[PDB]
């Protein structure tokens, strides 16, 4: 009855919110595993000491000695059973395959979450999937593995484990879809709401003078760096459009993106009769994270506040400006092309976001980086057809090298 969790990326935004839930409901949740990359070992050490995982994976093996030290400090305050450390590229896979856990919280960023996510599902474990990049890149493989071309989340296949959404928009849609019978599925239209990010209503030339600083101040949501930057480019919504296609089995024509700055409506579905079902809330990821862990039950928490529309003011809905923010067009083009185009788009974007965060390239060059890569992938072969997992790996790599080699125009 307890749910044993393995949290990947425990030190990030999603990971910490997950453990906040585990801490408030210790009778329900037990932590068997934590994984982190090593950039914040002080927090990993305090997480290990608090939750006493049996297994810990460390993405950077160079910092085993520092982790051991910080654990040794915590042991002097209070003794706890030392975990077995897992390392290397095979470490994440072994952790995901441990028996003795029910749910894998996949909150690693990027393509490095794909495989652990895959082997947990195959190992019969449910996956609360935050890592959108997995489904963007390896959508077909998830669809084949879960043996569905429709709704991948849930068990509405009415052995593999269940896949449940953590992202705010996919959670809203998934909650709104609860109770929609098969006769009304797929929905007519999927409405994904985007805050529009901090540069809403700015010209493309106003975006030349934009600092990393300004890009990292998000109006409605407090999150990681990559996702916050992607909301400023609107490549975050672009990625969610492709994720939705594979997750809900909807054509790209059925998928609409509305700029809703107040971020009150988290996303919606339109049904055959013209009824729209929308899920509303405050911008806190503990609701969706918790729903992925409790589905179909909903936990009542001290932070479980709820939105007051009278107080909130007024709700605005607008079309995105596809000229200024070309990343959204790039996602739609990539999705319609199919094959490994989604993968190349994601990798090119990951690289451009990192280069933008290391001050090597500027903001406007993120879109031009992604455009450059995909122009070339079009010129190279287009056989697509079947999408092998290794085919995704090869394109991801190729795209990363091309994204790094891109030199901004002079
Ligand atoms: N509000 C949200 O944040 C939100 C909402 C919806 C979806 N998502 C999606 O979920 C993913 C996580 O986003 P986030 O904001 O939580 O990212 P983040 O805050 O930057 O967290 C990154 C996590 O991944 C760990 N990590 C990095 N490299 C690793 C590696 N090689 N091996 C093991 N762990 C590694 C990191 O450890 P260290 O930092 O210690 O190195 C850290 O714990 C993203 O795809 C995001 O698009 C996020
Ligand atoms: O998990 C929450 N999001 O992905 C949405 C916040 C980013 P947006 O500006 O694209 O709505
Ligand atoms: Cl289905
Ligand atoms: Mg996280
Ligand atoms: Mg434990
Ligand atoms: Mg096609």
Residue numbers in the entry: 25 to 182, 221 to 472
Question: Which text from the study accompanies this structure?
Answer:
The 1-Deoxy-d-xylulose 5-phosphate reductoisomerase (DXR, IspC, EC 1.1.1.267), the second and rate-limiting enzyme in the MEP pathway, catalyzes the isomerization and the reduction of 1-Deoxy-d-xylulose 5-phosphate (DXP) into MEP. The catalysis occurs with dependency of a metallic dication (Mg2+) and NADPH as cofactors. TgDXR is composed of three domains: an N-terminal NADPH-binding domain, a connective domain and a C-terminal α-helical domain. These are arranged in a V shape, where the N-terminal and C-terminal domains form the two arms and the central domain lies at the vertex.
In this study, we present the first crystal structure of T. gondii DXR (TgDXR) in a tertiary complex with the inhibitor fosmidomycin and the cofactor NADPH in dimeric conformation at 2.5 Å resolution revealing the inhibitor binding mode. The asymmetric unit contains one homodimer. NADPH is bound to the Rossmann fold by interactions typically observed, while the pyrophosphate moiety interacts with the consensus sequence GGGNGA, establishing further interactions with the co-substrate NADPH which is bound at the identical position as found in other DXR proteins. The binding of the adenine and pentose phosphate moieties of NADPH is identical to that observed in the structure of the E. coli DXR, in contrast, the nicotinamide ring of NADPH is ordered in this fosmidomycin complex. Within the solvent-shielded cavity that is formed upon closure of the ‘lid’ residues 281–285 the inhibitor backbone lies parallel to the β-indole of Trp283 at a distance of ∼4 Å. The hydroxamic acid moiety of the inhibitor binds to the side-chain of Glu231. The sidechain of Glu231 itself is stabilized and positioned via interaction with Lys299. Fosmidomycin further interacts with the sidechains of Asn298 and His280. The sidechain of Glu302 also points towards the fosmidomycin, however the distance is roughly 4 Å indicating a very weak interaction or maybe this interaction is water mediated which cannot be conclusively modelled at this resolution. Not surprisingly, also the binding site for fosmidomycin at TgDXR consists of the same amino acids as seen in the structure of the EcDXR, indicating that the domain of TgDXR is similar to the EcDXR domain. The distance of the hydroxymate region of fosmidomycin to NADPH is 4.4 Å, which is too large for conversion (indicated by the yellow line in Figure 4C).
